[PDB]
Amino acid sequence: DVLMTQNPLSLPVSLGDQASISCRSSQSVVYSDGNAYLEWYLQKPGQSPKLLIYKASNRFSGVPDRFSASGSGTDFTLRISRVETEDLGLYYCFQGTHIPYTFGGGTKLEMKR
Amino acid sequence: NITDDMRGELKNCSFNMTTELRDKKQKVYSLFYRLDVVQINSN
Amino acid sequence: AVGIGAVFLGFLGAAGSTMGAASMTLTVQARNLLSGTVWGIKQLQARVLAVERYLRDQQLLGIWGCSGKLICCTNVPWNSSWSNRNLSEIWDNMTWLQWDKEISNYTQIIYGLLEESQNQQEKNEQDLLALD
Amino acid sequence: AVGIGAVFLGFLGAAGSTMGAASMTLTVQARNLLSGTVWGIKQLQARVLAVERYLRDQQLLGIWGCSGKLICCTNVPWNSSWSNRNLSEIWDNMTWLQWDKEISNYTQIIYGLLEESQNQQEKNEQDLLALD
Amino acid sequence: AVGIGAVFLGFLGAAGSTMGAASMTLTVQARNLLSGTVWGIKQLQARVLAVERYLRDQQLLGIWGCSGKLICCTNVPWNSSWSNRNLSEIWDNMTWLQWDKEISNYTQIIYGLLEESQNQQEKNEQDLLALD
Amino acid sequence: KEYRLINCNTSACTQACPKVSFEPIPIHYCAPAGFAILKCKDKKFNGTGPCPS
Amino acid sequence: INCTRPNNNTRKSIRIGPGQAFYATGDIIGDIRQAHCNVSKATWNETLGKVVK
Amino acid sequence: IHLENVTEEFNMWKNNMVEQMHTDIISLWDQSLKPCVKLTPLCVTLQCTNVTN
Ligand SMILES: *[C@@H]1O[C@H](CO)[C@@H](O[C@@H]2O[C@H](CO)[C@@H](O[C@@H]3O[C@H](CO[C@H]4O[C@H](CO)[C@@H](O)[C@H](O)[C@@H]4O)[C@@H](O)[C@H](O[C@H]4O[C@H](CO)[C@@H](O)[C@H](O)[C@@H]4O)[C@@H]3O)[C@H](O)[C@H]2NC(C)=O)[C@H](O)[C@H]1NC(C)=O
Ligand SMILES: *[C@@H]1O[C@H](CO)[C@@H](O[C@@H]2O[C@H](CO)[C@@H](O[C@@H]3O[C@H](CO)[C@@H](O)[C@H](O)[C@@H]3O)[C@H](O)[C@H]2NC(C)=O)[C@H](O)[C@H]1NC(C)=O
Ligand SMILES: *[C@@H]1O[C@H](CO)[C@@H](O[C@@H]2O[C@H](CO)[C@@H](O[C@@H]3O[C@H](CO)[C@@H](O)[C@H](O)[C@@H]3O)[C@H](O)[C@H]2NC(C)=O)[C@H](O)[C@H]1NC(C)=O
Ligand SMILES: *[C@@H]1O[C@H](CO)[C@@H](O[C@@H]2O[C@H](CO)[C@@H](O[C@@H]3O[C@H](CO)[C@@H](O)[C@H](O)[C@@H]3O)[C@H](O)[C@H]2NC(C)=O)[C@H](O)[C@H]1NC(C)=O
Ligand SMILES: *[C@@H]1O[C@H](CO)[C@@H](O[C@@H]2O[C@H](CO)[C@@H](O)[C@H](O)[C@H]2NC(C)=O)[C@H](O)[C@H]1NC(C)=O
Ligand SMILES: *[C@@H]1O[C@H](CO)[C@@H](O[C@@H]2O[C@H](CO)[C@@H](O)[C@H](O)[C@H]2NC(C)=O)[C@H](O)[C@H]1NC(C)=O
Ligand SMILES: *[C@@H]1O[C@H](CO)[C@@H](O[C@@H]2O[C@H](CO)[C@@H](O)[C@H](O)[C@H]2NC(C)=O)[C@H](O)[C@H]1NC(C)=O
Ligand SMILES: *[C@@H]1O[C@H](CO)[C@@H](O)[C@H](O)[C@H]1NC(C)=O
Ligand SMILES: *[C@@H]1O[C@H](CO)[C@@H](O)[C@H](O)[C@H]1NC(C)=O
Ligand SMILES: *[C@@H]1O[C@H](CO)[C@@H](O)[C@H](O)[C@H]1NC(C)=O
Ligand SMILES: *[C@@H]1O[C@H](CO)[C@@H](O)[C@H](O)[C@H]1NC(C)=O
Ligand SMILES: *[C@@H]1O[C@H](CO)[C@@H](O)[C@H](O)[C@H]1NC(C)=O
Ligand SMILES: *[C@@H]1O[C@H](CO)[C@@H](O)[C@H](O)[C@H]1NC(C)=O
Ligand SMILES: *[C@@H]1O[C@H](CO)[C@@H](O)[C@H](O)[C@H]1NC(C)=O
Ligand SMILES: *[C@@H]1O[C@H](CO)[C@@H](O)[C@H](O)[C@H]1NC(C)=O
Ligand SMILES: *[C@@H]1O[C@H](CO)[C@@H](O)[C@H](O)[C@H]1NC(C)=O
Ligand SMILES: *[C@@H]1O[C@H](CO)[C@@H](O)[C@H](O)[C@H]1NC(C)=O
Ligand SMILES: *[C@@H]1O[C@H](CO)[C@@H](O)[C@H](O)[C@H]1NC(C)=O
Ligand SMILES: *[C@@H]1O[C@H](CO)[C@@H](O)[C@H](O)[C@H]1NC(C)=O
Structure with missing residues (x-):
C-alpha cells in the first residue's frame, strides 16, 4: 500500500563530489508514537544490504559524517558528501511504520572517471 | 427566447x-x- | 522500524494467534472495554450499557473468587466431556475463537461449577475460621 | 416437579427464612443489583443511579478490606452493647429484616470501626513490610 | 470545640500537609470521587463520565495487582533517575502536589513498569502453580 | 402618519408572561464528584497570578 | 458525467413576514435552454461491455 | 476548608465557569419565555399621534 518512490534510477557522480538521492512516500510515514521510521540501505555488488541511517536523521553507528539524511513526511532525501570508491552500490530507502513495509525503487550510484 | 424542448417547462406566475x-x-x-x-379548474 | 510486535500488541491483534500466545495480550481488550439531542441520548445509552456490561463481568469474576485478576486459577477440575483435547493442542494450535466455538455448549455448566466451588471455598474458609 | 427449593433460590426468596439460611443465597440479590424522550431520560437516570449505588457499596466493601467477597470476616470484635443476643438465636431464629431493625442504631458505629480496623491493618501490613 | 482535626479530615484538607501525613486521609478523596432537558442531559453526561473515570482508575489498580487497596506495595524498585531525593525529604517535607509536579515526567514509565511487574508476578504464580 | 413596531422587519416579539418576575435571585454553583472549587481568599487579588491564600 | 443548468438564473427575495423571506426566481438573463448531462459514448460502451461480461 | 501553605494560579479572564454561567442564564431566559404569547398579530399598521396630555 505504501509505495516507496526513489529517484533518480541512476545517479552519476564524480569522486569527491556530492550526490543527492530523493525518495518520496505516497502517504505520511509518521507513526502514532511521533517518530518516522524511514531507513536508507546500501547493497554492494556481492554483499548483503547494509544499514546506513535509522530514523532518517540518526547515524547508524559511527558512519561517516559524509552520510547525512534529512527530510520530512512525504519527502525524504539522503545526501552523500565526498563520494569515495567504497560508496559504489545500490541505495534503497525503506519505511518501517505501516505494514506491509516497502523498499525504495533503488538508486544506482555511478562513479565518474 | 426558449428552445423547442423547453416549451411550457417554465411558468410566469403572479x-x-x-x-x-x-x-x-x-x-x-x-x-x-x-x-x-x-x-386548478378563460383564465 | 516499529516492528510487527506492535501489531500483536494492538486491539484484537492476537485474535488469529494461538490462545497460548493470545493469553499475553489480555489487558488490551480488558482496557478497550472501558475506552473513553436524540444523538446524545443514544450515545449516553450506549455508554451506560457498556458500563453495565463491564460491571456485570466484574461481578461474575468476583463471584468466582477471581476479582482483580485477568488470569485466575480455580479448583474446578476439567471434565473430559467438555473437551477431550490435549493441552498442547489447545494452547499451541487453536485460537480463542475456535475454542469458544467448541466449548460454547458447556459454558453455563462451567460457570455454575465455578460458582459452587467458590461458595464451597468461602464456607470452608469460614469454617476453618470457625476452628482457629 | 421443580420443587420448593427453586423458590428459595429466587430473588428475595429467603427474606422470611432465618438469616443463617438466608446467608446461602446472597449472590441472588447481589446479581439482581446489576440486572439488565422524557421517559428515556428518566430510565437512564434510574440506571445511572443504580450503577452509582452499586459502586458506592463496592467502594465501601473495599475500604473495609472486603473487596470481591460476599461474606467477609473481620478483626472488629462484637460489642455486647449492640446486641447481647446469643449466636444460636441470631443465626437460627431471627431473619435479616428483624436483625436490621434491631441493629439499625449502631450501623454507623460498626462502619467506622470497620474502617479504622482496615486502616490499622493496612498500616500494620506496611510496617511489617517496613521490617522484612 | 470540634477542633482543627476535623478540617484535616475534610475533603482536600491535607492538600497542604506533608504527603506522609496526607497518606492518612486517602479515603476522603476516594469516597468523594463517587459522591452522590438539556440541563438534565449535561448532568447525566457528567455523572456517566465520572463513573467511567472511576472505573478506569480501578481497572488500572487491578491491572497492577492493587485491587481493593488504597495503599499498595509493589515489587518495582525505585529508580534514582526519577528522583534522587531522600525518603525523609519526600515523606516529611514535600506535599503531594509538589511531588506530582516533580515526577510528572516519569509517570508513564512507572505505570508501564508496574504493569510488567504484575504480568511477571501473575505468570510466575501460574508457573509455580505449574509445579505444585 | 403611520407607524410600525421596530422589530417587524426582523422577527416577531414574544410577550413576557406578566406573572414571571425579572428580579434576580442568588444562584450557587457547586462542583460535581471528582471536582473541586478553589476560592482565592486574598483580599488584594487582582484577578490573575498566584493566590497565596 | 458532466451536468449543467445553462440558464442564468436570477434570485429574488420576497418578505413573507417578520424575519421571513421567500426566494423567488426572477427573469432569466439570456436564452432559456434545457438542462442536460453528458457522458462519453465510448467510455459508457466499454463500461457496459465490462458489466455484461 | 482552608488549604494551608497552598498557592494556586488563578485567571479570571480565561476562566471557565463564566461561559457556563452565561449559557445557563441565557437558557433560563429562553425557557421562561417559551410558554408566553407570541406577538405576531402586533405587526400591523399603526395610526399614531403625540400624547400632549
Ligand atoms: C413575468 O410577468 C411579469 C408581469 O407581471 C413581467 O414583468 C413585467 O415585464 C414588463 C416587460 O418587461 C414590464 O414592462 C416594462 O416596465 C418598465 C418599468 O416600468 C416603469 O415604467 C413604466 C413606463 O414605461 C411605468 O408605467 C411603470 O409604472 C414603471 O414606473 C418600463 O420601463 C418598460 O417600458 C419600456 O418598454 C415599453 C414597451 O412599449 C416602451 O414603450 C417604453 O418606452 C420603455 O422602453 C415596460 O413598460 C412590467 O413593468 C413588468 N411588471 C412587473 C410587475 O414586473 C416579467 O417580465 C415576466 N417575466 C418573464 C420571464 O416572462
Ligand atoms: C390579488 O388581489 C387583488 C385585489 O383583491 C385581485 O384583484 C382583483 O381581482 C378581482 C377578480 O379578478 C377583480 O374583480 C373584477 O374586476 C373587473 C374589473 O372591474 C371586473 O370586470 C370583474 O367583473 C371583477 O369584478 C378586482 O377588480 C381586482 N381588484 C384590483 C384592485 O385589482 C387579484 O385578482 C388578486 N390576485 C392576483 C394574482 O393579483
Ligand atoms: C454536452 O454536449 C453537447 C454536444 O453534444 C454540448 O453542446 C455544445 O456546446 C458547445 C459549447 O457550449 C457549443 O459550441 C458552440 O458552437 C457554435 C457553432 O460552432 C459557436 O458559434 C459557439 O460560439 C459555441 O462554440 C455547441 O454548439 C453545442 N452543440 C454541439 C452539437 O456541439 C454541451 O455544451 C455539452 N455540455 C456539457 C455540460 O458537457
Ligand atoms: C467534462 O468536463 C471536463 C472539464 O471539467 C472535460 O475535461 C476537459 O476536456 C477537454 C476537452 O474538451 C480537455 O481539453 C483537451 O485536452 C487534451 C489533452 O488532454 C488536448 O489534447 C485537447 O486539444 C483539448 O485541449 C481538457 O484537458 C479536459 N480537462 C480535464 C480537467 O479533464 C471533460 O472532457 C468533460 N467530459 C464530457 C463527457 O463532457
Ligand atoms: C428595519 O427597519 C429599521 C428602520 O428603518 C432599519 O434601521 C434603520 O436602517 C436605516 C438604513 O436605511 C438607517 O439609516 C437607520 O439609522 C436605521 N435605524 C436605526 C434606529 O438604527 C433596519 O435596518 C431594518 N432591518 C432590516 C433587517 O432591514
Ligand atoms: C448572468 O447575468 C448577470 C447579469 O447581472 C451577469 O453579471 C454581469 O456580468 C457582466 C459581465 O461579466 C458584468 O459586467 C456585470 O457587472 C454583471 N452584473 C451583475 C449584476 O453581476 C453574469 O455574468 C451572467 N452569468 C453568465 C455565466 O453569463
Ligand atoms: C408631534 O410629534 C412630531 C414628531 O414625532 C412633531 O413633528 C416634528 O418632529 C421633528 C423631529 O421628528 C421635530 O424636529 C419638529 O420640531 C417637530 N415639529 C414640527 C412642526 O416639525 C410634531 O410637531 C408634533 N406635533 C404634532 C401636532 O404633530
Ligand atoms: C428574444 O428573441 C428575440 C428574437 O427572437 C431577440 O431579438 C431578443 O433580444 C430576445 N430577448 C432576449 C432577452 O434575449
Ligand atoms: C463430567 O460430566 C459428566 C456428564 O455430564 C458427569 O457425569 C460428571 O460428573 C462430570 N464430572 C466433572 C468432574 O465435572
Ligand atoms: C494427546 O497426548 C497423548 C499422550 O499420551 C497422545 O497419545 C495423543 O496422541 C495426543 N493426542 C493426539 C490427538 O495426538
Ligand atoms: C451444542 O448444542 C447444539 C444443540 O443445541 C448442537 O447442535 C451442537 O452440536 C452442540 N455442540 C457441541 C460441540 O456439542
Ligand atoms: C462497646 O460500647 C461501649 C459503649 O459505647 C464502649 O465503651 C466500648 O468501648 C465498646 N467496646 C467495643 C469493643 O466496641
Ligand atoms: C445464651 O446462651 C447461654 C449459655 O450459657 C444461656 O445461659 C442463655 O440462656 C442463652 N440465652 C437465652 C436467651 O436463653
Ligand atoms: C434507636 O434510636 C432511637 C432514637 O433515635 C430510639 O427511639 C430507639 O429505641 C433506638 N433503638 C434501639 C434498638 O436502641
Ligand atoms: C533507571 O533508569 C535508567 C535510565 O532510563 C535505566 O537505564 C535503568 O535501567 C533504570 N533502572 C530501573 C531499576 O528502573
Ligand atoms: C540524604 O541522606 C544521606 C544519608 O547518608 C545524607 O548524607 C544526605 O545529606 C541526605 N540528603 C540531603 C539533601 O541532605
Ligand atoms: C519534563 O519534560 C519537559 C519537556 O517535555 C521538561 O521541560 C521538564 O524539565 C521535564 N521535567 C523534569 C522534572 O525533568
Ligand atoms: C460497443 O463496443 C462493441 C465492441 O466492443 C461494438 O461492437 C459496438 O458497436 C459498440 N457500441 C455499442 C452501442 O454497443
Ligand atoms: C510550607 O511550605 C514551605 C515551602 O513551600 C515550607 O518551607 C514550610 O515548612 C511549609 N510549612 C508547613 C507547615 O507545611
Whole structure:
C-alpha cells in the first residue's frame, strides 16, 4: 500500500563530489508514537544490504559524517558528501511504520572517471 | 427566447403574498417549473 | 522500524494467534472495554450499557473468587466431556475463537461449577475460621 | 416437579427464612443489583443511579478490606452493647429484616470501626513490610 | 470545640500537609470521587463520565495487582533517575502536589513498569502453580 | 402618519408572561464528584497570578 | 458525467413576514435552454461491455 | 476548608465557569419565555399621534 518512490534510477557522480538521492512516500510515514521510521540501505555488488541511517536523521553507528539524511513526511532525501570508491552500490530507502513495509525503487550510484 | 424542448417547462406566475405587516399584501411574481404547479379548474 | 510486535500488541491483534500466545495480550481488550439531542441520548445509552456490561463481568469474576485478576486459577477440575483435547493442542494450535466455538455448549455448566466451588471455598474458609 | 427449593433460590426468596439460611443465597440479590424522550431520560437516570449505588457499596466493601467477597470476616470484635443476643438465636431464629431493625442504631458505629480496623491493618501490613 | 482535626479530615484538607501525613486521609478523596432537558442531559453526561473515570482508575489498580487497596506495595524498585531525593525529604517535607509536579515526567514509565511487574508476578504464580 | 413596531422587519416579539418576575435571585454553583472549587481568599487579588491564600 | 443548468438564473427575495423571506426566481438573463448531462459514448460502451461480461 | 501553605494560579479572564454561567442564564431566559404569547398579530399598521396630555 505504501509505495516507496526513489529517484533518480541512476545517479552519476564524480569522486569527491556530492550526490543527492530523493525518495518520496505516497502517504505520511509518521507513526502514532511521533517518530518516522524511514531507513536508507546500501547493497554492494556481492554483499548483503547494509544499514546506513535509522530514523532518517540518526547515524547508524559511527558512519561517516559524509552520510547525512534529512527530510520530512512525504519527502525524504539522503545526501552523500565526498563520494569515495567504497560508496559504489545500490541505495534503497525503506519505511518501517505501516505494514506491509516497502523498499525504495533503488538508486544506482555511478562513479565518474 | 426558449428552445423547442423547453416549451411550457417554465411558468410566469403572479400571486398575492403577505408582507411583514399583517394588514398589507403585495403582488409578486415568480418563475415556477411546470413540475411544481398543477392547474386548478378563460383564465 | 516499529516492528510487527506492535501489531500483536494492538486491539484484537492476537485474535488469529494461538490462545497460548493470545493469553499475553489480555489487558488490551480488558482496557478497550472501558475506552473513553436524540444523538446524545443514544450515545449516553450506549455508554451506560457498556458500563453495565463491564460491571456485570466484574461481578461474575468476583463471584468466582477471581476479582482483580485477568488470569485466575480455580479448583474446578476439567471434565473430559467438555473437551477431550490435549493441552498442547489447545494452547499451541487453536485460537480463542475456535475454542469458544467448541466449548460454547458447556459454558453455563462451567460457570455454575465455578460458582459452587467458590461458595464451597468461602464456607470452608469460614469454617476453618470457625476452628482457629 | 421443580420443587420448593427453586423458590428459595429466587430473588428475595429467603427474606422470611432465618438469616443463617438466608446467608446461602446472597449472590441472588447481589446479581439482581446489576440486572439488565422524557421517559428515556428518566430510565437512564434510574440506571445511572443504580450503577452509582452499586459502586458506592463496592467502594465501601473495599475500604473495609472486603473487596470481591460476599461474606467477609473481620478483626472488629462484637460489642455486647449492640446486641447481647446469643449466636444460636441470631443465626437460627431471627431473619435479616428483624436483625436490621434491631441493629439499625449502631450501623454507623460498626462502619467506622470497620474502617479504622482496615486502616490499622493496612498500616500494620506496611510496617511489617517496613521490617522484612 | 470540634477542633482543627476535623478540617484535616475534610475533603482536600491535607492538600497542604506533608504527603506522609496526607497518606492518612486517602479515603476522603476516594469516597468523594463517587459522591452522590438539556440541563438534565449535561448532568447525566457528567455523572456517566465520572463513573467511567472511576472505573478506569480501578481497572488500572487491578491491572497492577492493587485491587481493593488504597495503599499498595509493589515489587518495582525505585529508580534514582526519577528522583534522587531522600525518603525523609519526600515523606516529611514535600506535599503531594509538589511531588506530582516533580515526577510528572516519569509517570508513564512507572505505570508501564508496574504493569510488567504484575504480568511477571501473575505468570510466575501460574508457573509455580505449574509445579505444585 | 403611520407607524410600525421596530422589530417587524426582523422577527416577531414574544410577550413576557406578566406573572414571571425579572428580579434576580442568588444562584450557587457547586462542583460535581471528582471536582473541586478553589476560592482565592486574598483580599488584594487582582484577578490573575498566584493566590497565596 | 458532466451536468449543467445553462440558464442564468436570477434570485429574488420576497418578505413573507417578520424575519421571513421567500426566494423567488426572477427573469432569466439570456436564452432559456434545457438542462442536460453528458457522458462519453465510448467510455459508457466499454463500461457496459465490462458489466455484461 | 482552608488549604494551608497552598498557592494556586488563578485567571479570571480565561476562566471557565463564566461561559457556563452565561449559557445557563441565557437558557433560563429562553425557557421562561417559551410558554408566553407570541406577538405576531402586533405587526400591523399603526395610526399614531403625540400624547400632549
Ligand atoms: C413575468 O410577468 C411579469 C408581469 O407581471 C413581467 O414583468 C413585467 O415585464 C414588463 C416587460 O418587461 C414590464 O414592462 C416594462 O416596465 C418598465 C418599468 O416600468 C416603469 O415604467 C413604466 C413606463 O414605461 C411605468 O408605467 C411603470 O409604472 C414603471 O414606473 C418600463 O420601463 C418598460 O417600458 C419600456 O418598454 C415599453 C414597451 O412599449 C416602451 O414603450 C417604453 O418606452 C420603455 O422602453 C415596460 O413598460 C412590467 O413593468 C413588468 N411588471 C412587473 C410587475 O414586473 C416579467 O417580465 C415576466 N417575466 C418573464 C420571464 O416572462
Ligand atoms: C390579488 O388581489 C387583488 C385585489 O383583491 C385581485 O384583484 C382583483 O381581482 C378581482 C377578480 O379578478 C377583480 O374583480 C373584477 O374586476 C373587473 C374589473 O372591474 C371586473 O370586470 C370583474 O367583473 C371583477 O369584478 C378586482 O377588480 C381586482 N381588484 C384590483 C384592485 O385589482 C387579484 O385578482 C388578486 N390576485 C392576483 C394574482 O393579483
Ligand atoms: C454536452 O454536449 C453537447 C454536444 O453534444 C454540448 O453542446 C455544445 O456546446 C458547445 C459549447 O457550449 C457549443 O459550441 C458552440 O458552437 C457554435 C457553432 O460552432 C459557436 O458559434 C459557439 O460560439 C459555441 O462554440 C455547441 O454548439 C453545442 N452543440 C454541439 C452539437 O456541439 C454541451 O455544451 C455539452 N455540455 C456539457 C455540460 O458537457
Ligand atoms: C467534462 O468536463 C471536463 C472539464 O471539467 C472535460 O475535461 C476537459 O476536456 C477537454 C476537452 O474538451 C480537455 O481539453 C483537451 O485536452 C487534451 C489533452 O488532454 C488536448 O489534447 C485537447 O486539444 C483539448 O485541449 C481538457 O484537458 C479536459 N480537462 C480535464 C480537467 O479533464 C471533460 O472532457 C468533460 N467530459 C464530457 C463527457 O463532457
Ligand atoms: C428595519 O427597519 C429599521 C428602520 O428603518 C432599519 O434601521 C434603520 O436602517 C436605516 C438604513 O436605511 C438607517 O439609516 C437607520 O439609522 C436605521 N435605524 C436605526 C434606529 O438604527 C433596519 O435596518 C431594518 N432591518 C432590516 C433587517 O432591514
Ligand atoms: C448572468 O447575468 C448577470 C447579469 O447581472 C451577469 O453579471 C454581469 O456580468 C457582466 C459581465 O461579466 C458584468 O459586467 C456585470 O457587472 C454583471 N452584473 C451583475 C449584476 O453581476 C453574469 O455574468 C451572467 N452569468 C453568465 C455565466 O453569463
Ligand atoms: C408631534 O410629534 C412630531 C414628531 O414625532 C412633531 O413633528 C416634528 O418632529 C421633528 C423631529 O421628528 C421635530 O424636529 C419638529 O420640531 C417637530 N415639529 C414640527 C412642526 O416639525 C410634531 O410637531 C408634533 N406635533 C404634532 C401636532 O404633530
Ligand atoms: C428574444 O428573441 C428575440 C428574437 O427572437 C431577440 O431579438 C431578443 O433580444 C430576445 N430577448 C432576449 C432577452 O434575449
Ligand atoms: C463430567 O460430566 C459428566 C456428564 O455430564 C458427569 O457425569 C460428571 O460428573 C462430570 N464430572 C466433572 C468432574 O465435572
Ligand atoms: C494427546 O497426548 C497423548 C499422550 O499420551 C497422545 O497419545 C495423543 O496422541 C495426543 N493426542 C493426539 C490427538 O495426538
Ligand atoms: C451444542 O448444542 C447444539 C444443540 O443445541 C448442537 O447442535 C451442537 O452440536 C452442540 N455442540 C457441541 C460441540 O456439542
Ligand atoms: C462497646 O460500647 C461501649 C459503649 O459505647 C464502649 O465503651 C466500648 O468501648 C465498646 N467496646 C467495643 C469493643 O466496641
Ligand atoms: C445464651 O446462651 C447461654 C449459655 O450459657 C444461656 O445461659 C442463655 O440462656 C442463652 N440465652 C437465652 C436467651 O436463653
Ligand atoms: C434507636 O434510636 C432511637 C432514637 O433515635 C430510639 O427511639 C430507639 O429505641 C433506638 N433503638 C434501639 C434498638 O436502641
Ligand atoms: C533507571 O533508569 C535508567 C535510565 O532510563 C535505566 O537505564 C535503568 O535501567 C533504570 N533502572 C530501573 C531499576 O528502573
Ligand atoms: C540524604 O541522606 C544521606 C544519608 O547518608 C545524607 O548524607 C544526605 O545529606 C541526605 N540528603 C540531603 C539533601 O541532605
Ligand atoms: C519534563 O519534560 C519537559 C519537556 O517535555 C521538561 O521541560 C521538564 O524539565 C521535564 N521535567 C523534569 C522534572 O525533568
Ligand atoms: C460497443 O463496443 C462493441 C465492441 O466492443 C461494438 O461492437 C459496438 O458497436 C459498440 N457500441 C455499442 C452501442 O454497443
Ligand atoms: C510550607 O511550605 C514551605 C515551602 O513551600 C515550607 O518551607 C514550610 O515548612 C511549609 N510549612 C508547613 C507547615 O507545611
